[PDB]
Design a protein that fits this description.
- Helix 2 packs antiparallel against helix 4 and helix 14 runs antiparallel to helix 15.
- About 25% of the residues lie in helices and about 25% in strands.
- By secondary structure, the chain is an alpha/beta fold.
- The chain has three domains: about 230 residues, Phosphoenolpyruvate Carboxykinase, domain 1 (3-Layer(aba) Sandwich); about 110 residues, Phosphoenolpyruvate Carboxykinase, domain 2 (Beta Complex); about 270 residues, Phosphoenolpyruvate Carboxykinase, domain 3 (Alpha-Beta Complex), CATH 3.90.228.20.
- Strand 1, helix 1 and strand 2 form a beta-alpha-beta unit.
- About 50% of the residues are buried.
- The longest helix has 18 residues.
- It binds guanosine-5'-diphosphate (GDP), manganese (II) ion (3 copies) and sodium ion.
- InterPro entries: PEP_carboxykin_GTP_CS, PEP_carboxykinase_C, PEP_carboxykinase_GTP, PEP_carboxykinase_GTP_C, PEP_carboxykinase_GTP_N, PEP_carboxykinase_N.
- Pathway: Carbohydrate biosynthesis; gluconeogenesis.
Length: about 600
Amino acid sequence: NGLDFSAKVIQGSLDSLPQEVRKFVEGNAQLCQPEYIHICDGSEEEYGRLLAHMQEEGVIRKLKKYDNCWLALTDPRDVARIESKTVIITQEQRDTVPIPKSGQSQLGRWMSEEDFEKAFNARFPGCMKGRTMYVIPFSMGPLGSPLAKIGIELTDSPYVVASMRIMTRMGTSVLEALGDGEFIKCLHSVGCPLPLKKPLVNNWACNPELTLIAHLPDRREIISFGSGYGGNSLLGKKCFALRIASRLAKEEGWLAEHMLILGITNPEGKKKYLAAAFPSACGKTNLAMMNPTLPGWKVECVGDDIAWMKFDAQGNLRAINPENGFFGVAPGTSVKTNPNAIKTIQKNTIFTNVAETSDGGVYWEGIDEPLAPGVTITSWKNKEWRPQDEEPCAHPNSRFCTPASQCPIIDPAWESPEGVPIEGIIFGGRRPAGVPLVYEALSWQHGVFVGAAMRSEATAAAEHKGKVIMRDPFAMRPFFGYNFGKYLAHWLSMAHRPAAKLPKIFHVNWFRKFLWPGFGENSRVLEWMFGRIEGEDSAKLTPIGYVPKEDALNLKGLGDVNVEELFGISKEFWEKEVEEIDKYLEDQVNADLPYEIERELRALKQRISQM
Ligand SMILES: Nc1nc2c(ncn2[C@@H]2O[C@H](COP(=O)(O)OP(=O)(O)O)[C@@H](O)[C@H]2O)c(=O)[nH]1
Ligand SMILES: [Mn+2]
Ligand SMILES: [Mn+2]
Ligand SMILES: [Mn+2]
Ligand code: NA
């Protein structure tokens, strides 16, 4: 009877699969030994029954206050991305990360093919025993689009299948769009075959000790073991659309970036599109769907996390959002801070590690909504919670997984397969001191240097504690698919291609100490950027780049804001900054640092010495 798993197919048919899709499914069905195989069709009925099954299994809880919303609570050991267990396999180490002068590289983690094979054999054989292998055909980008890249995710987590339905275009239509074309091979398992050898915490299957998120770009495979958290288990998102995609992008002449895409319209009706790279949990989602406080202005959301970008024939940098939803940080989200998000997350939305009110609603730190007297709160740890306990009701990296199409200000061209023309790129992070509210790069090369110099306080999105200022060039430290030096060269090369309308490059700091209220008020910084792209004489030259002139920023309704402190450029801070950037780039980028980046470093060092 061959290696035929037709007898265990519980939805769909192996005969209906493309030739190479069948081999991929059956080959891993042989390795992983699932009891059932569920080929996903992506239908509403499948989604409802999947949620009902998880509810019956005690995996998720229904939120009775809302329209088809659900709550998952995880094992506390499996709450975020884990960079130290995140690896890229290549033949040569140099292709994946530059060879550092000292210790280990901070720009990724390389693992040899031999090392990974042994790790792979220690984990995956029989790992799905007693479980259903779900087969997820998903499209990153819109269905039909020649830009879109299709993947097949195999997983034993129904939480992953439900989340992938939101975060990607998922179903039978993807298999029909694929045919005998190429697809990314995504393999995932929580790593707890039945019968369970280890006790199960919060009904959340996971394997912390053996957690491993591997990328094999040469083989076009993503292999992920042990973790159910979205960043580690939704393999279309970070693993494919940043790590695997950024390498493909380098090879084919496009860009895959950790960037929101937004459209901003002035009072007249003139529209511009901006992209912005901030590190995980440093303000992308809130900016991408902001409610602008300036009257007449209008922000619209194309995407909040991943941008795929390429020059068209006319020289416009065209961006698309390859995702289908927002996997956004929960705490802080309110009608004050992010009202467009709240209109999105009230239906067809899955929440993870947030608190639950007794009347079937969600709760977290900074929700800015006092409860009725008598309404009690169950925490993310499934305990009865009160502020007398010093612990927060929701985990810091708790999430909502919501459809993008439900955003009130979703851009009418967000599914356009030609993309939206980018006229501005914004870099930034959490710098509590020294860095101005906004500056503008002097050229493309300086702009690329500014991206490379980026630093930001650590967040709960990965394993890093203490709120320490880490290096995060382009907000891509955890996501480089290949050598960062080559990545810099790829970016710099975009200046050389004829007729290229290069976006203006800016750097922002919302988080200086906060000296700036942020959220909707950042529309004032976006106004200045809008004008500078138009070419208004609203900029003053400083050593670090152009800053807004006196009376350039609309601060009407904000006379209290200290402009001197917020835009202060200290020689003492900045001569220290360039020294720290020098040592980092030499240590970590080393022989693969392009000359032009070193020239901008020497030029910035020079300008600071003249202060
Ligand atoms: N102070 C301040 N906080 C912000 C701002 N934008 C977002 N945040 C907060 O920082 C966290 C991350 O924001 P988010 O937009 O979700 O970051 P993302 O993960 O990069 O999309 C949330 O808890 C927000 O409340 C801002 O402009 N100022
Ligand atoms: Mn992100
Ligand atoms: Mn986000
Ligand atoms: Mn050049
Ligand atoms: Na659970």
